[PDB]
Amino acid sequence: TVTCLQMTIYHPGQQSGIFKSIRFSSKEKFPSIEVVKFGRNSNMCQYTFQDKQVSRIQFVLQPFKQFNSSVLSFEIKNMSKKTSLMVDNQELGYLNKMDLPYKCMLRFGEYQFLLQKEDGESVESFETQFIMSSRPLL
Amino acid sequence: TVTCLQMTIYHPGQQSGIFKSIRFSSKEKFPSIEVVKFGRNSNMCQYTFQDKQVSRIQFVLQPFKQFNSSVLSFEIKNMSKKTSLMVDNQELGYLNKMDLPYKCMLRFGEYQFLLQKEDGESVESFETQFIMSSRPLL
């Protein structure tokens, strides 16, 4: 099995088309070499948001392995200078990083990201899946 | 002033042409967005080695900021499934990571890397410098 990071995302103005370029429901597979970027720039970020309130690159997610663990984990790093990044009740400034648990909440601007990791056997590949939440998450 | 990572490298086959692609003595600037990659593949790594005992991508270096401290630090992560990576006295398997102190020793295969962080005040970019050592470092 491939480890998939399910991301349930919400924004108060999500119907405006800020997720116009995001492909939901389906799974997309990445190699373990990849650093997945989120932001406003389509040339830099794999996942783009049609929103001027989001930095050119908002933050990045990359897979890693905890010591003597045979499965993937994910580390996050804030790439935004003006906007902070809330990993539950821990605030991340510019170029701050943190190892994500199995279940955590992401907040930046007025975006809400529910993050749940479902593990697999693989360590050389991971998948992502986006689900748009109709109601707020908090 | 920019934070520079000075890397002193040693390998007994350094005269054979392993380092014919590495520009020594110079400084090279990198944005804080970029993740530095070392390995055998010239299309996947910024700094490449001709040795066939080096994996496609040996390991990665990326900048970040520890909490409170507004100066750049560096995280290393082994990208080699086969060859383990030694940071001072700690072994790193595939996708194992570790944050580097100002001065530490890297070791993979027959390679030896001396890493020293020369702090600058800029957090928007960093620089690298390669120094060759006639004598082994350990």
Residue numbers in the entry:
A (entry chain B), B (entry chain A): 12 to 149
What's in the article?
TRAF-interacting protein with a forkhead-associated (FHA) domain (TIFA) was originally identified as an adaptor protein that interacts with TRAF2 and TRAF61–3. TIFA has an FHA domain, involved in its binding to phosphothreonine (pThr), and has a consensus TRAF6-binding motif [PXEXX(Ar/Ac); Ar, aromatic; Ac, acidic; X, any] at the C-terminus for interaction with the TRAF-C domain of TRAF6 (TRAF6-C). Furthermore, oligomeric forms of TIFA promote oligomerisation and polyubiquitination of TRAF6, leading to the activation of IκB kinase (IKK). TIFA exists as an intrinsic dimer, and phosphorylation of TIFA at Thr9 promotes its oligomerisation through the intermolecular interaction of pThr9 with the FHA domain between the dimers.
Size-exclusion chromatography experiments of T9D/C36S and T9E/C36S showed that the phosphorylation-mimicking at Thr9 is partially involved in the TIFA assembly in solution (discussed later). Although it is difficult to discuss the original effect of pThr9 on oligomerisation even with the use of these results, the crystal structures of T9D/C36S and T9E/C36S provided structural insights into the assembly of TIFA. The TIFA hexamer in the T9D/C36S crystal shows a large buried surface area of approximately 1,400 Å2 per dimer, and the interactions between the dimers are also observed in the crystal of T9E/C36S.
